[PDB]
Each structure stands twice: as structure tokens, then as C-alpha cells.
Symmetry: D2
Subunit: 287 residues, 4 copies
Amino acid sequence: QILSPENAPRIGFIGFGAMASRMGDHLKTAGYTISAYTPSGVPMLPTPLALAKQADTVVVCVPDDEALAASMYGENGALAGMTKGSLLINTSSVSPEATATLYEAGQKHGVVVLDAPVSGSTPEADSASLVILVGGDKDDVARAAPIFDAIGKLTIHAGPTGSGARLKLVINGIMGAGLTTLAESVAYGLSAGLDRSMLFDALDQVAVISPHHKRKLKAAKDGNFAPQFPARLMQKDMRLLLDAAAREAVPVPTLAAATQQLSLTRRLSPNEDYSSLIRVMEKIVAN
Amino acid sequence: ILSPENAPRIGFIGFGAMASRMGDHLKTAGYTISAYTPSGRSPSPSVPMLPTPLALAKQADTVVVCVPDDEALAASMYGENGALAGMTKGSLLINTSSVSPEATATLYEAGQKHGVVVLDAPVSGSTPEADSASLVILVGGDKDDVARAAPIFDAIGKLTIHAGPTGSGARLKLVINGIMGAGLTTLAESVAYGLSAGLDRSMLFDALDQVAVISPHHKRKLKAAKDGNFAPQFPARLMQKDMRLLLDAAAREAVPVPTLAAATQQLSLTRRLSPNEDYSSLIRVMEKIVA
Amino acid sequence: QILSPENAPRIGFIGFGAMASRMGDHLKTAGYTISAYTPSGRSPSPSVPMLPTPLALAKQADTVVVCVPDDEALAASMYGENGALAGMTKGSLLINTSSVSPEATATLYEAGQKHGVVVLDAPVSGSTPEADSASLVILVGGDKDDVARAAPIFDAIGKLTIHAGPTGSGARLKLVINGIMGAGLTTLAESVAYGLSAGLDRSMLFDALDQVAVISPHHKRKLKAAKDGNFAPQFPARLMQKDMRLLLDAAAREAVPVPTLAAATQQLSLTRRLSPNEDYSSLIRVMEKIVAN
Amino acid sequence: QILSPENAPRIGFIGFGAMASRMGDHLKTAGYTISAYTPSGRSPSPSVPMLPTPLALAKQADTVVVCVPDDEALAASMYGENGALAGMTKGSLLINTSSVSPEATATLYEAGQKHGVVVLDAPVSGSTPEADSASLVILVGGDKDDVARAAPIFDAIGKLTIHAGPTGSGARLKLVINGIMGAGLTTLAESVAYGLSAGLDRSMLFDALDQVAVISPHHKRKLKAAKDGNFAPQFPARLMQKDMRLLLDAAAREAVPVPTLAAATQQLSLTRRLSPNEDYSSLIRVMEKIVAN
Ligand SMILES: NC(=O)C1=CN([C@@H]2O[C@H](COP(=O)(O)OP(=O)(O)OC[C@H]3O[C@@H](n4cnc5c(N)ncnc54)[C@H](OP(=O)(O)O)[C@@H]3O)[C@@H](O)[C@H]2O)C=CC1
Ligand SMILES: NC(=O)C1=CN([C@@H]2O[C@H](COP(=O)(O)OP(=O)(O)OC[C@H]3O[C@@H](n4cnc5c(N)ncnc54)[C@H](OP(=O)(O)O)[C@@H]3O)[C@@H](O)[C@H]2O)C=CC1
Ligand SMILES: NC(=O)C1=CN([C@@H]2O[C@H](COP(=O)(O)OP(=O)(O)OC[C@H]3O[C@@H](n4cnc5c(N)ncnc54)[C@H](OP(=O)(O)O)[C@@H]3O)[C@@H](O)[C@H]2O)C=CC1
Ligand SMILES: NC(=O)C1=CN([C@@H]2O[C@H](COP(=O)(O)OP(=O)(O)OC[C@H]3O[C@@H](n4cnc5c(N)ncnc54)[C@H](OP(=O)(O)O)[C@@H]3O)[C@@H](O)[C@H]2O)C=CC1
């Protein structure tokens, strides 16, 4: 009962933005028929219910808990439109609480919900280099493998339901605080009189910055903050992680500070790349 | 022009984990090595030891300094027994220690009064990179004096960054130290959340090796931390000192750095609990909090 | 319209813990008849009749006062087949003194509107000693006319009613005050810890700080208690840390950078992990232990 | 040898700014003869003779009081052939009221000992209004008998002398109180900022916070001034942020984790960068402007 294009050709999306649309292109190449629902308007369906009624597998890619609940539940929601025995793959970055609510609601419809957020942004989605972080029973993960293989380079089975959502929060913290650390360290360097191009070029050559953050640093050198992961979404992910860390009573001061810097970043420019904090701190130092 | 032919003798003020490793690559490149340490001992028993900084400098052509902090630097640089009193006008002093911008300016000016150019040339990389001569040299000074020292820098490292005039190497080292320190505290806290939320420890450590948002340095520390291996490459006492220097400098420049400030406090706790183990032991500290 | 004991004698509580039980005694003294629902069926007041469900509580009260720990407990007891809201008559008032999120507040206000029920968000400034002495400060969101209706209830349990604005304003003002209280304590605990680490005599240091103008009366009381190792719960760490989580979530939703509040929250997470049930001021003891090793 | 006006009438000041000139007024009233040295030779007190060097100041004074901004200024005027120590006599007392580091305090104490001069580290709690009213709290480190020698001086300028311990204890206790003051302000600025960002009425919010028990009297006075946009300096951001820098350096040297104090320090760096000379409470305005955009 693998979800190959032979057994399950129709994949309906709930949400179809920068990430899901690039996933869909890869699933199309792999031989699936793609449909999609978005509250605004590949064939578009009018409701989540209608989307689910004409799909074999539903993939969800929505911004937050509120959007997830608005489209999963109620008589016009996605769950009302799928059939016992089918699978719902949620690739959204949402809270552990929302993950548990949807898993339990899926169980009442006979629908297995995999929490399968991804590591990687729009360039990795373009190249199908996403890393899938999936929670669920190993047998249900196996059913979704052709889907995961088409959109990504690696599927990490993180544990039972909820484990993928948690692993995504871990990686989001590392990403977000990695950027705020870099912006702050660059700002000190500029404030202490270091030549800007020297400094940016020097940091490209050290081993203590990630490949992801080195790519952001190079873009920031030219002032390029075209959105790959917009500040509004990075800051939301930081909010979710801090809430989850507080619920577990784990003290995370570096992540907490980073979140506040990303709040400023979102306020000043919600739609540019989250790396624009580098420019924000540069402007603080120049004034 | 400080090739082994022209200037074969390199004397070290301080000769511990980093400097003894640099000394081996300089020995291999053809230089004659000598050292001073306050204890009279070092990891390299085959290196002649001199009784004072003054005595070390009087029998070396170039002096390399590698001491723990500002206070150690002033103790061995100044006064009638210090290194400056022993070097000759026109020679180079190369400071690879991680010290404050204030200490750097004090030594440069003191050097000028002796006719000695002081390059502030801290390095990026730890004991594994010193072993393999993969250090990145971060050097402040005039471009002509930097060119004079290139044979020395090439022997101990894989890249020399001319950061600007005197003081620029010290500042760039502070920048890179902040990225390293807060990179570790970020990773320790993120791992701690994951464990507190029920993720299998072995799965989580292995999964994070697979993602592009952790640096190669911090991936190596995560693998060591999976093994409980915190043998000192960069001890907490020195990493936390370096964070203290960075936050002092950021406050003097009035630059708000909340992520770096949070990370420093986590590294204070790390040093308090274990000053001599690797600074990455914060990962173990956080694991014990969540247990 | 005024919810005096003559016009509306029956006050039913959803939640009846440390704070609500003390408000109930002042409401009993003012002439009201008190009833309550809790999930355990128990309360600090054995004389108070217990109803078996939130719906049953609401069906036999003229006014309902809610005092529950968090958003989840609120939703569990106001909504669903046995929730309290559907048990209330049109034109009646629901008074929520719980410290919950602005989102939970907006959801309850809108659900109340659908049922014809006015919901006042009326959290309180003060802890169990202020509840004991009816010296709470009520922070209330709603229309002036609806606040006026609740005035005899607010007057019995508190010393001052601040009309913070329309619906949601009380909840927001409570979060502001919570932030000041939480970070005031973490600031004090960390400053004391430096002092002790630098060799200052403990008794001298605690007494000296009682003499300075830069500590609040509330935190000076906590400092004297901490000198005695007295962390009997007035505001337990589990609830203070929850309130800080709510404040940081709200500040993130508004995109306001609050690094001092964010750091304080992490210190209170450690405090709650080590002792969820003692007073939140126990971080002072936590920090003393860190510097002693 | 009590340092009464009859026993030691001449008090010479090293530094004579906002704090010291007010101290000197109260010492003049108490019967002392005041002189001063400043690097600019300028001071708002016309009756105070200005001496041209720290050396010259100390040579014509019986007791020397120091009130300089930081470690660097202290070392410039204390040491060397033209410094103050070179001009005082064995058996005299130097009273340092400056807010300086523990390291600077130890260095001056030991330098004083080589000169036979006892150095009391005696920073003060309180700002320009407290110096005007001699309401300062003196925080003094040293031997009990030397503190007793300085009692008439301390009584003239303040309302309370806290003997914090041996040499260095006053410097450390000042750092403790500075942290409480600075983080108390940043907490308050961020909490107000959240409340405004969440739509609360500004005048409502400022007036409500004046009524709560979790804000100190000092910070309530700052909040009232901020309601009017008044940040005329009493304690300028450049000096408060310097004191926070000293506290965080000392906390790092003691390896004490203080995340709330560290976060507050960074907010006060932003405050100093935007306006070094206005009152440190100007962060309230900084945060209002962030939220207003
Ligand atoms: N680099 C990245 O972009 C990363 C993204 N993620 C996560 O992936 C998810 C989406 O990312 P991205 O695709 O970039 O975000 P986008 O904002 O680009 O796409 C958002 C999509 O969600 C749709 N949507 C909004 N509300 C609803 C709703 N109530 N029901 C159904 N669909 C809805 C929008 O449709 P409309 O146009 O009608 O609003 C749009 O199609 C988020 O959870 C994000 O955090 C995680 C890591 C990295
Ligand atoms: N990963 C690392 O290890 C990194 C190191 N650095 C910087 O390099 C410098 C040294 O690091 P490392 O070599 O690891 O530290 P070590 O402690 O291993 O070496 C310290 C050396 O300094 C000597 N020393 C101490 N006080 C004095 C003094 N007053 N005069 C002369 N020598 C003295 C010690 O001699 P004795 O044994 O007699 O005390 C020992 O030889 C520090 O500034 C450190 O921050 C920078 C980045 C990373
Ligand atoms: N100083 C303080 O204590 C302050 C408290 N507050 C806020 O006041 C509220 C109550 O505080 P406090 O009285 O101290 O808390 P307590 O923990 O002392 O009492 C909690 C009460 O809520 C009840 N409860 C739990 N879950 C539910 C539910 N789903 N439905 C109904 N009742 C429920 C408990 O009943 P059971 O025993 O059956 O669980 C108990 O009666 C919280 O929001 C707190 O943050 C605000 C400021 C200060
Ligand atoms: N609320 C406050 O203002 C409080 C301040 N403090 C501490 O008290 C000290 C001074 O505070 P305040 O008086 O307000 O600061 P001011 O800036 O008002 O006065 C500074 C004084 O120091 C003098 N000065 C500067 N450098 C030297 C030097 N090298 N040698 C001698 N004198 C020097 C200046 O002289 P010139 O004018 O010639 O530069 C000026 O007279 C600082 O340590 C401050 O942190 C402590 C408690 C309260």
C-alpha cells in the first residue's frame, strides 16, 4: 500500500506557497497529479473539503497553527473529505500542541497524520535537497517514501508522532540564533573600525560558520535580502520554539535573545529574508 | 623577509597547547626554536627554555607571544625583565594571544618606543588546526611588516588575512570568538529542548550531523559530545575569558549584542562547573539540566 | 443591572484555588452565595458546595467567575458538551480573573457574544496576601457600562478597579505587570548572586538592599522572605513561569523586542524545573546555590 | 583621629561634577573648607578654589575625596609624580566615591598602602536629587576604625552609612545596586513597550503602573518623567551603561551567570548610542519609538 504514483496518483495540497509549489513541481516530475487549495486561489479547488475529496494523499504546507486548524477541521475542512485508510502528510512548521491535536483528529477519521516538516529553504526545495524530519510509525513512513524521495535527498525518521515537529523546532533554533549571532558579531567588528569587505571576506573563510549562514553572509555583503525564508516566518518559528521550551521548562537564554532580535527584524521588514538583521545591525552601528 | 635563511631564530613567550604545535611546524620549516614559560616547562621537551622574557628575546631574531590573557601579557612584556627590554630595534614581535583591544594598543605603543614593530596576529583554529597547520592568521599592522612575517605565517597556517592596521587582528579575533561561543551555546540549548521534548538522544545527535545550519567546527564538537569527550582543545576558562573580552569591547563601542551576551552567561556557568574541560562541555551541562 | 447581592446573589466559580477561594470568602462576607466547580472536586474551602461539571455550575449561578491556570484549562471548561458558557442566560456576566493569553481572551469574548453573555477580562494585580486582605487591583477590559455592573463584586475582592480599555485590555495590562514582577525578581536574584560571589557577607547584603530605593515594595518583601529561606507558595513558580511564557508569546506576536523579559523567562523556566510548587522567588535560593557550588 | 572639621578642616576633591559639587556644598555647611581639582579647571561652585594638579590639590588638603567617571580617570589622577597620592601624608585618608571596577579599587588600595594612606572605597547609592538633600546611602569598604574616622564626612553628605565589609566591599555593593537599577529600567521600558504595542492607551498605562507594588519608587519617578518625555539627565546613559559594563565584567570574572543583567546591559548600550547624555531612562522613549514604527 505504498503511495507510489501507481497506487496513489492524486496529491492534493492544503497550502501552495514558495515551498509547496516547488515540492509539487518535483512530485509532478515523479508522475503524480497535483491539485491545491489556498484561501485566495495547477488546478485549484474551492474548499479544503473539495480538495480532499478529489485527492488520494493530502500534503499540508500552511504558515501556522491557526491556518492549520482553519483548514483541517469543520465540515468544510480537509479531514471531512478524506477516507479511512488514507494518509495526511503535514509539512508545516507548527506547534507540538497543534501536531497532537491533528494526529488525534486524524485517528477519528481513520487517517494517519505524519508530521513531516523539512529542513532546507526554497533553493533546497528547487533542487529536491530537502531533509525530511518525520514522526510516526515506521510502517506509515514507509508508505510515504516515494513522496519523500521525490521532494528530498534524505528522510530522517525522528520517532513516533510529534517527533518531526520537535526536530524541526530544534533545527529552527539553530538557524535563527546562528543568524543573530553572526549579525551581532559583524556589527561589533564594524563598530570597532574593521573594513567591511575585509570582514565579510574573512568570515567566509572560517570553520565556525555554517554553509547556510555563509550563503546568507555573502548575500548580505551585497545588501541582497530577496526572500528565501522571510522574517515573518522565521520569527514565527522562533516564537513556537520559545513557547515549547517554556512548556518543557528548559532554560534557553541564547535562543530567547535571538528571538527578540528576530522580532525587531520582522517589525522592520516582514517580507524580506530573515537574514536582513545583518543590515539592521549595520544601520545601528552606522548611526 | 623573515625566512629561515634571513632570520632563523624564533623565540616564544608562552609555549602551551597552541604555541608548541606552531613551534613544530616552524622547526619543520627550518627555524630554530626557543621558549620561555613561567614554569620552565612545555609539551616539547626538546625545545630550549630561557629563564626570563628578557633572556628569550636577546637570543632570538623574531619573538612570538602566546599567553592566556592581558595580565599575563603585561607580566612578560614590560619591566626590566620583560621581552621588550631584550629585543633590538628593527625586529618584529608577533602576538598570537587573544587579548583585549586595550592591551593590544598598549603593547603596540610600548613596542614603538623600543623601535620594535608589534603585529597583533591571533589565529582562527584550535589544536587540531595547529597540528595540521590549517590555522587562519588574523593580522593587524602595516602591509610591509605583514609581508616580512609571511614565511612564519605560511608555516603555521593555511591562510593569512591582513585585517587592517594595528589592533585589527585582535578585533577580528573577538568577532570570530563570539561566533564560536554563541554557536556552541545555541547548539547546546537547541539539543536540550529536543531532549526535553522526548527525542531519542542518539537519533537527535546523528540527525543534526545531517543539516546545513551547523558549522563544521560545531559538528565536530557535537560528535565529541555524543561520546562525552570534552578533552580540552579550547578550555572553558579561556573561551569564557574571550567572551568577557568581547562583551567588554562591545560595551565600549556601545553596540547591542543580546545573543552574544546570553551566550557569555552560559559560558560563565560552563566555566564555573568545569574550567579545564573543553568549552563544548556546556552540551553535557544542558543535558544534565534536562535530566 | 448592577450585580449586587440583592439582584444577583449566586456567584459560581470555575476554578477555586489559592486565589479564587480567598476572593470567595470576601464575596461571602459581602452577602453573596458561593458555589464552585473544580476538576478534582476539591478546594481549600470545605464549606463551599461543589458542582460536578462547568455546565452544572453555570446553570445554577447568576454570575460566573473564572479563575483557572491557563488557556487549556479555560477552553476545557468553557466549551464542549459540558462547558460553562452554554449554561449561562442571555444578559448575564462572565468575569474571567484568570491570567490567560490575549488570543484565549478574544476567543472567549466572541463565544460569549454568540451566547448573549458579556465577558469581562478582569485579571488582578496582587497575590494571596492581597487576596486575603481584599487589596487586589482589578485590571478590567470591557465597556464602561458592563464594568459598572460588576462594581460590587470588584469592590468586595479588591481595593481599586482600573478600567484598562475595551475587551482584551485587562489581559494585556496583566501581562505588562507580570513582566515587571518576573524580571524584577530575576534581576534581584542575579545581582545578589554576583554580590555573594564577590565575597559580600550574606546577612549584610540582604539587609543593605532593604535600604535602597531601586527595589519595589513587593520584591523587598520577597528578599526578606528569601533571607529566611521562606518560599511558601504565594505565587508558585509553575504559574509565574506560565505567565512569562504568555507574555513572551504575546510580545512575539506584536513583534516587540523584549530581551530583558526574554532572559528573565529563561531564569524562571529553570526555577520552575527545580521547584514548580514553591514561590517563584525561590530563584534567589537557586542562584545562591550556583555561587556556592 | 576622627575627621571632624575641627580635626581635619580641609577637604580636597579630585573631580567636582554633578555629584561631587553637591556633596561639597553639604560639607561646606558642615564646617569644612572645600577645594577641588578637575582636568578642565571648571566647576559650578564659585567659592571653591581650583588647584592646577592632583598633586597640588592633595598637598593643601587634610582629606581627599575622589569622584571621577571611570577606572581610566582614576588612574590618570591618582598615580605618577603629579598624582594625588604623591601629595598626601602618611596617616591621612582618601575616600573614593567613584563607581569603578573591583580591580581598580584593589590597585588604588595597595598603592595607598605604600604611601601610608588608607583608601576607603565609598561609592554612594542615590542620584543628584539625593545628593541635593544629603539622602545618599554610603556603601563603604574598609577597616571598622577607618570607617569611624570618616563618619562626620559620611553623615554630612548622606542619610545612612552601610559598612559593607573590608576594602573592596563598597565597590562590589555598588555594582550590585547598579545592576538592580539598570535592569529595573530596561524591564520597565520593555513592559511598557509591549503594552503600547498591544493597543493599550498610553495615559491609562502610565497611570496604572504608578499604582502597582512591583515597581520601585525610583523607577516610578522615572516613569512619571517619561510620561512627559522628560529625560533631562539625573544619571546619564553614558554613566549607567559604563556601570553595567563594569558589573558584567566582574560577573564574568567571578563566573556567575546573570542573563537578565546581561540583556539589560545590551539595551543600555543601545540607549547610550542613541543619546549618551540624556537620563538613562530614555530607553522608555527608545522603545516607544520602536513600537510606533
Ligand atoms: N524556507 C522556507 O520557506 C521554510 C518554510 N517552512 C515552513 O513551511 C510552511 C510554508 O512555508 P512557505 O511555503 O515558505 O510560506 P508561504 O507564505 O510562501 O506559503 C504560504 C501558503 O499558505 C497558504 N495558506 C495561508 N493560510 C492558509 C489556510 N488557512 N489554509 C490553507 N492554506 C493557507 C497561502 O495561501 P494564500 O496565498 O491564500 O495565503 C500560501 O499558499 C510554513 O509553515 C513555514 O514556516 C519551514 C522552514 C523553511
Ligand atoms: N583553541 C585554543 O586553544 C585557542 C587559544 N587561543 C589563545 O591562545 C592563547 C594560548 O592558548 P593555549 O596555548 O591554548 O593556552 P595554554 O594554557 O595551553 O598555554 C598557556 C601558555 O602560556 C604560558 N604562560 C602563562 N602565563 C604566562 C606569562 N605571564 N608569561 C609567559 N607565558 C605565560 C604557560 O606557561 P606555564 O605552563 O608556565 O603557565 C603556557 O606555556 C590564549 O590567549 C588563548 O585564548 C585562541 C583561540 C583558540
Ligand atoms: N499570586 C497568584 O497565585 C496569582 C495568580 N494569578 C492567576 O490566577 C489564576 C489561578 O491562580 P491560583 O488560584 O493561584 O492557581 P491554583 O493552582 O492555586 O488553583 C488552580 C485552580 O484551577 C482549577 N483548575 C485546573 N484546571 C481546571 C479546569 N480545566 N477547569 C476548571 N478549574 C480548573 C484547580 O482545580 P484542581 O485542584 O481540580 O486542579 C484549582 O482549583 C491563574 O491564572 C494564575 O496565573 C495571577 C496573579 C497572581
Ligand atoms: N547619579 C549619578 O550621577 C551618580 C553617579 N555616580 C558615579 O559618580 C562619579 C561621577 O558621577 P558625576 O559626578 O555624575 O559625573 P560628572 O560627569 O557629572 O562629573 C564628572 C567629573 O569628573 C571630572 N573628571 C573627569 N576625568 C577626571 C580625571 N582624570 N581626574 C579628575 N577629575 C576628572 C570632570 O571634570 P571635567 O569637567 O574637567 O571633565 C567632572 O568634574 C562616576 O563614577 C559616576 O558613575 C554614582 C552614583 C550616582
